[PDB]
């Protein structure tokens, strides 16, 4: 059988599967209250992608596709965002997943920049294209997020220079944390549909354990506060298990974080089949290891393996 | 254990210059220009050269803080100091041409600033403040001097920037006539040399030509359909930085395959340098199927003679 391994990156070597951004750091804290059911960053250790994941960090809360109207009243212009699988061809609604793949996995205001460029070229300008770009606001708890359904509604605030043309979304962070629910999933299909296609909810069932994150900090376009999101796994570990697909010999992997200068273990961890990492400790309080560290896979083991206390 | 590259797909991968995925591959005469990248420059045994870091989202990405101002008619631009992407002061007598991820074309870099306050508010629970607004950082701007702590970033008549830590986050260009990827800028300024670069690459065998991964780039406005094309995607610098796989010559052949129906299409040479030559004279579609990807078959050297692409 193929040997399983995980990447040797560093956290500052490894960007989140949830947002297009560096890892910050490892967090652990208690999850008994809260429902973890994220559907970027989901990818089995023997290389299953599940929810919306996909390959790409940069199309990561990315959309593709064209505008066809405006609908904006008050408040700011709106526009109607018909939105395509990342490689341009139709989504398909009857497949198996959740929506889009990269759509976000939150409820928030995702701040970002909607870019043009025309269809055709305009005969004025030697046939070349007209292209603009500008801020905008894809409110994920808005009756017209319906991803599934193939559409978006984008804000501009007072920018009324959007035309019905091809259009791509780059997340930049949120528009305001008032409401960011990293845990709360969006309506992939607009009010009282239910969602389709996911990823399962994960939890720790081992007493004692918590579920270990990787956790970024996200930028704001104004307000206040410091708002993270928490990723199961980076997208690095995706993209390496999607490609080595190696067979998962027990649904559980004991993985040791370790700090390749010193040679030394740090501390050790369960890596179940499903795709994510479990810890034992009680509470939330800072992890203490080095920049240099990264997770080696050592033996399989199984659910009952009792984990020395990080 | 021996010497593998991704099977990731052109449409699995981002171009190491700039954070977007990869539209296409492309190959065209480069006699008459100096082909010297700075960004996704790795050698295939694993070792990083130029400004190359491992993060696609930091690829054209600054960070650091604001510390000053300056009018310009009705418009604003602000002197952005720069740190490593760690957040460590950057060292100028480190062997590297600028902080890794610098862009490394001459051209008008598009994007978002955005600011967290370095102290609380207690009005607000002692959480920071924040604001995020667009600008442009001009490459060919005498003050462009990243290697020497610093960068200007111009935000048009936005106001609201702050003398606070701040990261940049690239989006495109803000013109097409004035961007020309394979001119470097000067990381040190006016009359200034750059150092600690990675070298330039070319074709030494007769018939050949490099084999690049374009993208196209978004504009803030007006005309054009500008592209970007890197020596290897992202996600191999990444692959080779771990493996680092010994190179047995200086020269891999590869294939590029269709695993669906398991047919080879065409081959080329994977230099240890880090860049790829093909038998092909002139630039023409490229005629490869979406699922197609490189794989290693063996050890040549500079002297193998390609089939034709
Ligand atoms: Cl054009
Ligand atoms: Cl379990
Ligand atoms: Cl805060």
């Given at each position: 059988?193929?040997?399983?391994?995980?990447?040797?990156?560093?956290?500052?070597?490894?960007?989140?599967?949830?947002?297009?951004?560096?890892?910050?750091?490892?967090?652990?804290?208690?999850?008994?209250?809260?429902?973890?059911?994220?559907?970027?960053?989901?990818?089995?250790?023997?290389?299953?992608?599940?929810?919306?994941?996909?390959?790409?960090?940069?199309?990561?809360?990315?959309?593709?596709?064209?505008?066809?109207?405006?609908?904006?009243?008050?408040?700011?212009?709106?526009?109607?965002?018909?939105?395509?699988?990342?490689?341009?061809?139709?989504?398909?609604?009857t497949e198996d997943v959740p929506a889009p793949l990269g759509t976000p996995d939150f409820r928030g205001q995702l701040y970002g920049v909607?870019?043009?460029?025309?269809?055709?070229?305009?005969?004025?300008?030697?046939?070349?294209?007209?292209?603009?770009?500008?801020?905008?606001?894809?409110?994920?708890?808005?009756?017209?997020?319906?991803?599934?359904?193939?559409?978006?509604?984008?804000?501009?605030?007072?920018?009324?220079?959007?035309?019905?043309?091809?259009?791509?979304?780059?997340?930049?962070?949120?528009?305001?944390?008032?409401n960011f629910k990293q845990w709360e999933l969006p309506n992939y299909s607009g009010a009282l549909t239910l969602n389709m296609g996911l990823?399962?909810?994960?939890?720790?069932?081992?007493?004692?354990?918590?579920?270990?994150?990787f956790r970024s900090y996200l930028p704001l376009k104004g307000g206040y506060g410091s708002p993270f999101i928490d990723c199961l796994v980076?997208?690095?570990?995706?993209?390496?298990?999607?490609?080595?697909?190696?067979?998962?010999?027990?649904?559980?992997?004991?993985?040791?974080?370790?700090?390749?200068?010193?040679?030394?273990?740090?501390?050790?961890?369960?890596?179940?089949?499903?795709?994510?990492?479990?810890?034992?400790?009680?509470?939330?309080?800072?992890?203490?290891?080095?920049?240099?560290?990264?997770?080696?896979?050592?033996?399989?083991?199984?659910?009952?393996?009792?984990?020395?206390?990080?």
């Amino acid at each position: 059988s193929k040997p399983f391994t995980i990447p040797i990156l560093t956290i500052g070597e490894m960007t989140n599967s949830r947002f297009p951004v560096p890892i910050d750091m490892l967090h652990t804290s208690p999850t008994e209250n809260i429902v973890v059911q994220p559907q970027n960053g989901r990818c089995t250790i023997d290389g299953e992608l599940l929810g919306t994941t996909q390959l790409i960090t940069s199309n990561i809360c990315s959309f593709r596709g064209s505008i066809s109207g405006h609908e904006g009243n008050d408040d700011q212009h709106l526009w109607h965002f018909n939105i395509t699988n990342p490689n341009g061809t139709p989504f398909d609604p009857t497949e198996d997943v959740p929506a889009p793949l990269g759509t976000p996995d939150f409820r928030g205001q995702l701040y970002g920049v909607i870019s043009q460029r025309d269809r055709e070229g305009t005969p004025s300008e030697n046939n070349q294209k007209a292209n603009r770009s500008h801020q905008g606001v894809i409110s994920t708890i808005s009756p017209k997020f319906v991803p599934k359904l193939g559409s978006v509604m984008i804000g501009t605030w007072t920018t009324d220079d959007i035309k019905n043309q091809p259009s791509k979304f780059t997340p930049i962070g949120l528009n305001d944390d008032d409401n960011f629910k990293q845990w709360e999933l969006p309506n992939y299909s607009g009010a009282l549909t239910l969602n389709m296609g996911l990823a399962p909810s994960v939890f720790p069932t081992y007493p004692g354990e918590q579920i270990l994150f990787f956790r970024s900090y996200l930028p704001l376009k104004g307000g206040y506060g410091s708002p993270f999101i928490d990723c199961l796994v980076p997208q690095e570990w995706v993209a390496h298990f999607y490609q080595e697909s190696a067979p998962a010999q027990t649904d559980v992997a004991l993985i040791r974080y370790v700090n390749p200068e010193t040679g030394r273990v740090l501390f050790e961890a369960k890596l179940h089949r499903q795709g994510f990492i479990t810890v034992a400790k009680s509470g939330d309080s800072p992890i203490n290891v080095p920049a240099n560290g990264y997770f080696r896979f050592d033996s399989w083991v199984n659910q009952f393996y009792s984990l020395a206390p990080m």
